[PDB]
Design an enzyme around this catalytic site. Sequence first.
Site, PDB file in Angstrom:
ATOM      1  N   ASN A 276       0.796  -1.215   0.000  1.00 12.42           N
ATOM      2  CA  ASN A 276       0.000   0.000   0.000  1.00 12.42           C
ATOM      3  C   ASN A 276       0.825   1.259   0.000  1.00 12.42           C
ATOM      4  O   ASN A 276       0.284   2.361  -0.062  1.00 12.42           O
ATOM      5  CB  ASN A 276      -1.074  -0.098   1.092  1.00 12.42           C
ATOM      6  CG  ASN A 276      -1.868  -1.398   0.883  1.00 12.42           C
ATOM      7  OD1 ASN A 276      -2.121  -2.167   1.827  1.00 12.42           O
ATOM      8  ND2 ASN A 276      -2.233  -1.633  -0.395  1.00 12.42           N
TER       9      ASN A 276
ATOM     10  N   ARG B 252     -19.287   7.310  -3.786  1.00  8.42           N
ATOM     11  CA  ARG B 252     -18.757   6.131  -4.438  1.00  8.42           C
ATOM     12  C   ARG B 252     -17.224   6.330  -4.134  1.00  8.42           C
ATOM     13  O   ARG B 252     -16.727   7.431  -3.812  1.00  8.42           O
ATOM     14  CB  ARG B 252     -18.785   5.887  -5.946  1.00  8.42           C
ATOM     15  CG  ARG B 252     -19.975   5.561  -6.785  1.00  8.42           C
ATOM     16  CD  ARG B 252     -20.562   4.206  -6.475  1.00  8.42           C
ATOM     17  NE  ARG B 252     -19.974   3.051  -7.156  1.00  8.42           N
ATOM     18  CZ  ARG B 252     -19.839   1.855  -6.552  1.00  8.42           C
ATOM     19  NH1 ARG B 252     -20.211   1.699  -5.276  1.00  8.42           N
ATOM     20  NH2 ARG B 252     -19.313   0.797  -7.177  1.00  8.42           N
TER      21      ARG B 252
ATOM     22  N   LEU C  76     -13.933  11.252  -4.544  1.00 11.85           N
ATOM     23  CA  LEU C  76     -13.041  12.266  -3.960  1.00 11.85           C
ATOM     24  C   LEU C  76     -11.848  12.559  -4.889  1.00 11.85           C
ATOM     25  O   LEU C  76     -11.197  13.614  -4.943  1.00 11.85           O
ATOM     26  CB  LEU C  76     -12.613  11.759  -2.578  1.00 11.85           C
ATOM     27  CG  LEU C  76     -13.486  12.112  -1.362  1.00 11.85           C
ATOM     28  CD1 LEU C  76     -12.942  11.387  -0.135  1.00 11.85           C
ATOM     29  CD2 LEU C  76     -13.514  13.616  -1.094  1.00 11.85           C
TER      30      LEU C  76
ATOM     31  N   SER D 207      -9.332  10.069   3.325  1.00 14.26           N
ATOM     32  CA  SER D 207      -9.190   8.982   2.372  1.00 14.26           C
ATOM     33  C   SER D 207      -7.738   8.832   1.948  1.00 14.26           C
ATOM     34  O   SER D 207      -7.202   9.862   1.504  1.00 14.26           O
ATOM     35  CB  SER D 207      -9.960   9.339   1.077  1.00 14.26           C
ATOM     36  OG  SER D 207      -9.805   8.348   0.067  1.00 14.26           O
TER      37      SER D 207
ATOM     38  N   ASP E  72      -6.192  -3.017  11.264  1.00 13.93           N
ATOM     39  CA  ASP E  72      -5.597  -4.117  10.506  1.00 13.93           C
ATOM     40  C   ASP E  72      -4.827  -5.087  11.371  1.00 13.93           C
ATOM     41  O   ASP E  72      -4.406  -6.134  10.882  1.00 13.93           O
ATOM     42  CB  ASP E  72      -4.688  -3.481   9.438  1.00 13.93           C
ATOM     43  CG  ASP E  72      -5.518  -3.086   8.216  1.00 13.93           C
ATOM     44  OD1 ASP E  72      -6.708  -3.429   8.077  1.00 13.93           O
ATOM     45  OD2 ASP E  72      -4.888  -2.462   7.343  1.00 13.93           O
TER      46      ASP E  72
ATOM     47  N   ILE F  51     -14.148   2.497  15.054  1.00 19.15           N
ATOM     48  CA  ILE F  51     -14.657   3.138  13.854  1.00 19.15           C
ATOM     49  C   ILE F  51     -15.422   2.162  12.984  1.00 19.15           C
ATOM     50  O   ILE F  51     -16.548   2.444  12.558  1.00 19.15           O
ATOM     51  CB  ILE F  51     -13.522   3.755  13.003  1.00 19.15           C
ATOM     52  CG1 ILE F  51     -12.574   4.692  13.728  1.00 19.15           C
ATOM     53  CG2 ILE F  51     -14.183   4.527  11.857  1.00 19.15           C
ATOM     54  CD1 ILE F  51     -13.057   6.056  14.155  1.00 19.15           C
TER      55      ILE F  51
ATOM     56  N   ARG G  79      -2.437 -12.499  -1.963  1.00 23.38           N
ATOM     57  CA  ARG G  79      -2.463 -11.190  -2.543  1.00 23.38           C
ATOM     58  C   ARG G  79      -2.029 -10.089  -1.582  1.00 23.38           C
ATOM     59  O   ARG G  79      -1.710  -9.028  -2.151  1.00 23.38           O
ATOM     60  CB  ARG G  79      -3.865 -10.833  -3.036  1.00 23.38           C
ATOM     61  CG  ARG G  79      -4.286 -11.759  -4.146  1.00 23.38           C
ATOM     62  CD  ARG G  79      -5.803 -11.561  -4.239  1.00 23.38           C
ATOM     63  NE  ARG G  79      -6.174 -12.508  -5.298  1.00 23.38           N
ATOM     64  CZ  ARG G  79      -7.404 -12.496  -5.826  1.00 23.38           C
ATOM     65  NH1 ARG G  79      -8.259 -11.600  -5.350  1.00 23.38           N
ATOM     66  NH2 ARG G  79      -7.613 -13.407  -6.780  1.00 23.38           N
TER      67      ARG G  79
END
Lengths: 419, 419, 419, 419
Positions: C23, C120, C124, C162, C305, C327, C397
């Site tokens: 990421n 969606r 943004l 985001s 995570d 959250i 993955r």
Amino acid sequence: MDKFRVQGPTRLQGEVTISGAKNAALPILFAALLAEEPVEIQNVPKLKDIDTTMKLLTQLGTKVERNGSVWIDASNVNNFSAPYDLVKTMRASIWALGPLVARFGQGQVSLPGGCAIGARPVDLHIFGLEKLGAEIKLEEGYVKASVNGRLKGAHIVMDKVSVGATVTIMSAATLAEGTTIIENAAREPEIVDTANFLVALGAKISGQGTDRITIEGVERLGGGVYRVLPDRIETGTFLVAAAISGGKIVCRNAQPDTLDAVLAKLREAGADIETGEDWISLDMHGKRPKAVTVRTAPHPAFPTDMQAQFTLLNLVAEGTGVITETIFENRFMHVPELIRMGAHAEIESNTVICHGVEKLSGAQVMATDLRASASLVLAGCIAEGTTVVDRIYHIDRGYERIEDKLRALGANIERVKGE
Amino acid sequence: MDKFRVQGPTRLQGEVTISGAKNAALPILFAALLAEEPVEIQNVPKLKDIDTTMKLLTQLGTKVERNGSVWIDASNVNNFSAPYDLVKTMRASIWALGPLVARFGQGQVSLPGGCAIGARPVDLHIFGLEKLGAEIKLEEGYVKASVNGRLKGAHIVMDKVSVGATVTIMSAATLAEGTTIIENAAREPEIVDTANFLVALGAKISGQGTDRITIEGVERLGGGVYRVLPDRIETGTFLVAAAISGGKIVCRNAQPDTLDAVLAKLREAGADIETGEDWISLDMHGKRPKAVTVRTAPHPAFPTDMQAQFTLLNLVAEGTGVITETIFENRFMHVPELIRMGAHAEIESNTVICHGVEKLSGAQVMATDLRASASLVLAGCIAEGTTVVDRIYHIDRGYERIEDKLRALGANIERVKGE
Amino acid sequence: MDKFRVQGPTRLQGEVTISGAKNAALPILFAALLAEEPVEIQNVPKLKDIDTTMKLLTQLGTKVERNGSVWIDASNVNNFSAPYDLVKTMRASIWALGPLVARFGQGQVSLPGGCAIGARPVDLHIFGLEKLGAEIKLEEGYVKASVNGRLKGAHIVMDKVSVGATVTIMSAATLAEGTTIIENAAREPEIVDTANFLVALGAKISGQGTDRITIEGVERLGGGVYRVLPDRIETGTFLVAAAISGGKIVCRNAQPDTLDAVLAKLREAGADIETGEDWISLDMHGKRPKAVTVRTAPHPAFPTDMQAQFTLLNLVAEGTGVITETIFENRFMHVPELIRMGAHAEIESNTVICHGVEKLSGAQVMATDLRASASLVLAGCIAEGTTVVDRIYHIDRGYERIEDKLRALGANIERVKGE
Amino acid sequence: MDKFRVQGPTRLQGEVTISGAKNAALPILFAALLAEEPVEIQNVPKLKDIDTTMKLLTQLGTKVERNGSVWIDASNVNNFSAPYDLVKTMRASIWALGPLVARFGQGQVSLPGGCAIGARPVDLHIFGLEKLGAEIKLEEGYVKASVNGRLKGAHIVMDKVSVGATVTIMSAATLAEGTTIIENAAREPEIVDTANFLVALGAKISGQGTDRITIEGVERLGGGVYRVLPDRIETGTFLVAAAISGGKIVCRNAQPDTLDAVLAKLREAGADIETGEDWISLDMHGKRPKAVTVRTAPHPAFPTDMQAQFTLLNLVAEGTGVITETIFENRFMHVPELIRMGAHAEIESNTVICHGVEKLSGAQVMATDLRASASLVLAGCIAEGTTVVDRIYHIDRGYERIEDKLRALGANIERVKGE
Ligand SMILES: [NH3+]C1CCCCC1
Ligand SMILES: [NH3+]C1CCCCC1
Ligand SMILES: [NH3+]C1CCCCC1
Ligand SMILES: [NH3+]C1CCCCC1
């Protein structure tokens, strides 16, 4: 005077079962004096010092019986003096001193006498016991040791590596109060075996096999079952017999990791070697050995007790080989005998420059060192004609009836008593 | 004359990254003269002999460029004479001789002169090349070698273990016709690295790290990428700095199996050591080292290049420690300097009996051996007050800027140029 | 479908090399489209999305090659559309939009349809680019952004935090004229690493890691070498694997400061953690963890995570500990699986109440979330017997061969290709 | 039901210790009922039937203890019935009948019912005892044999060759008055070993191994130590495991002369076999076996119990080879399983025509025969992938932990407790 009449040449091939090492069996039998409960010591060779040792042990009040194993009951040891008539025969009898003082607070061992003073074999054992808190009393012919209470763990720096002394100090340190650390400890596999037997009985020992042994004294030692390790030198001897005769053998009841340097030298000689957890096979595939360069050094390097045997291998190998003896001065008496059997060699100081000859010729030979004497029987096996090895008692004392083992590999050998 | 002004005491803790070994980098850089294709030699320390070596290589027609790695293009080497102005500076320049004769049939190296004759450092290289078929020509100040065609594989018996000579013979033997067997070969990790670099290029070598190296000559060597092994002595040096200061360190880019004896001695000193595939950590947990008994011996035994460093450790340890030097006579010049810093020791022949003191006192000290000099910087770190180590160029030549590494572990050290 | 068959219990210990964060690697690969000169992206994991991205980048005219690094030459981009065939496989492909329009004046990304309309994913990104002066063209199947001249810096207030939109806006802004302010920018370490890469090519970015990122547009971005930060979640997973199996582990190529909250929680669980600048060691010392209380929140608080993994640590720990998701909703779907392995927990609202059990039992389990699925493998390793984790493709993955890394730590694991 | 999950391919190499033959151990344990003095039965495998037999023997008043040996003291047998509960589990329990009647004058064995009548298993045992003078009493549920005084030697012609009936007759005859002749006696090595044990306790038996066994009844049988012969079928299984995986193996505690036909066939397959008196080595030298022709026949010809294993060797060998069962029908039910692993074979009548394939593929397989089931595990080890062998309990009852022995040779195998 039994002699061996050997007729060759004979290819040596087949199987041999290796005997327990007498040099592991002896210190473990003396260490068994520390055991309060009965002990079964397995895989003990049937040799003269084993018999002198059981007789001695019996004199101290030990209950001893034998046959494959040596069963010991030392719970009632009550005579702490090793007398001259039982000890004059064997230097290893010094090993009764440490256990008697560590366990009973007193011990005395008669000593064999001499005009030569300084670094005599027993001196490091006396000072190792003294270091551990024992009070030593000496008068020509005996050493008496006693301790007020328990021995006390000490940090001992050995200035010279001594198997003898390492065993005495280590074994006595198991019942000492506290921790003993031995610096420059002998690393011989017989040292590791004696340390493991002691551990088997309840001792706290570590670093055996390394140059620093640590012993944490405990209150008493128990009993148990312990198998003496295989004789690595007798194994090497057999491996050289097949290697010098184009032979193929399997050494059963072997311990391959006690012979790394020996096997590596055999592989340099052209030998095809495989090993198991308890076996070693060697195949020359009918080829003559290739000459090797050898340097004897302390375990785990190439052993000096394999030097005469490797001298013989170079002496019939293809090429020029050098054997350098760094342990012992003067351990080349097999050389003049082999030169008499047709070998080509030059002794330069503590080395022999060997020039391999295809075949040796039979002769009346004699050596006083048991490894040299056994090397002579081996050359006799591959030599042309008849070889008469005299004063064979030197072999009998360290090899459980080599002629039977050799005869079983195809040798033409016979014991000749008297004449 | 740069000197180091060290102020203590300081606990040494943190991380240090170990440099590639110059003693692996040098023989590999000279061996790169055999490579027909470009080579990348990584992890090369930035030290004076590396710079002299690249300059020399450049003089022979080698294309050389540097920075972490040393990239070499030896495809067009065409000047086979190593001149005195480039070689007077460095004894390792003898290593250009073997590669030039093996690959180009001719080579000549200027030599530094002297009144002392017999077993001079280059003598075994000359005779090793001669053994391999080279014709040697000598006149005071140079050695010229040439061969008619290819060198020829030979069975060489080294009477003395020589790292220098082992490298010369091994490296030249890669392009020789047939098989070369070196008996009594040096086993140093720098020997194994040089053998692996050669293998990386296409050579056929086995037994490196053992006392018998076998080389099967090939036609030419190619190119490739090769990383020089970590400097095991610089690693030991750092491990002693944290061990003598109650410190805790992590040595990054280390190679633990090149230091078994050193780590074992540190663990006997009370160090808490863990190692990875490329790292070694050491923690004294704030404790004073415990004194140790050390005997220097050939690799893989305790290294003589770690002896001065371990002298210093005993000298501040708890207890009495003995350091026995068996490799080098006269390698105890750090002793009188440390006695001046408040140490208690007795030199008896090739040994030092050390009696640990809690703290040393700062002094103006100097040693010419780089391991002794570096031991002095280390004592300076833990000593009270200020220590001035003069003639620091001896350290700079074998340690990539030790003050920066030490300063990074908390040392108060400063380079003082001139005065 | 591929499944992982795991055999426990096993103590997980050893070393593990942490891979680059995927990421961080995805947003950096796309950002490389802005680089006029070649770039080497080091430390990029070998995962499906990386493959899809290189494939997508190649289709635009980019020259890309891989292995430990990803080498990109975006000097010849000549195609400005990311087609449905390449993008339908990956949501991250939207990241091609901003760099294409910023650098080339136009970009087009195909979008997969859906009947849901309204905040969606990409709105943004679309609207952030539009605030930067791009003209946006939308047709159900795709988004096209374009600009005549340069984009222009804008003050942008994000209504939702985001990471995806922060990356698109920030990357595009580096080439815009003027100053761009992003308020409510994502603060994750992967944002910070993307900003740092951009700055490495010559961008002017500050506040990365804060609620406000300020960008000063530059006219062009260069090239260079940039190393992707370590995967912090994979790091916590392996740290949890040691912590729950009485282990000891060294996480290499780690970045301790991106995991402060996880490390603090592990110390609360009984773990003996040490950190360096690129490594983390954790030792349980053969002990069971102690239950901990966890509240997941936005970085830099405890990461959601890491929740699945710490839920498994509490379920095998000593005591009761509750895990709250502050959250996110519906995040404990792996708890019913773990309860099927003998775990004790109540799931109440957004919290899982855990009552540690000493040992789990293998079961057939499945989690659809990558992290919960990785937690179930970890659970297989410590459970008694065999655990079969189904639908493992999520882990393949997101984790670079977790089976090889687990296996090196002691796990007994098998990939089962059939269902 | 327990299954074995195997992962291949794996090369099987190393050492394996052959266990005592179960079918030699069962008839010897029951024969020990005749021994008046304590007996030590060494080399007895730990298998279900051995457990059932010790349990059965204890119920008669026998004192039995186990581990590598089975120690029996049948001096106090006081109960002469083997009840349904102990015997319904094992057909071999009929072997209690002959020794009970011979020694104690009476014996009773419960038999499981069946609606089939006519040359039923035990009718040779019943009628053989009756020819020895016993009175036989039959009621559907059991058989009782008894005699007043001693049994009396008889000339017995067996109409069918039976190992079971041969053992009952021969064992009982050792205590009978006079001479017993058994014509058409079973010749298997396990018969020979039973006769040899009997002779070791003092019986007079000759012709064991021949078509005629002659027994001279003695009044009493003693005690002693007797070692069960090595399992020849397990030995061939392990020899086949090396032979089919390009292996190298040493079978320890083997008896080469009970496997001449198997060894000759293996040499025909390309195997490099060497034998000693208690070991067998086989080396494929990394090569694939060559197809062989096999005809199974009565000992000492090729054994039907090695057929499944050699069928698997031919199916992975180089070439075509056919396997014929000369006596037994319906013995290739494992071939359809092996064809499901990618094998090529036609089953025509009592023969399987094999066309070797280079590699098998894992499959889910099951064989109900012990030997075919063991062949399917061997097949799992060499096949690509995972093989799941179901209903493994047959192998557990006939092979002493084959999974531990396979595993030591390199097999990756798992016992799956659920179905
Ligand atoms: N690679 C890292 C090892 C853990 C300690 C520091 C080096
Ligand atoms: N326990 C340790 C392992 C990593 C290097 C530092 C200490
Ligand atoms: N246990 C046996 C090993 C194979 C060779 C002979 C000994
Ligand atoms: N290949 C061999 C292994 C067993 C002992 C004899 C030779």
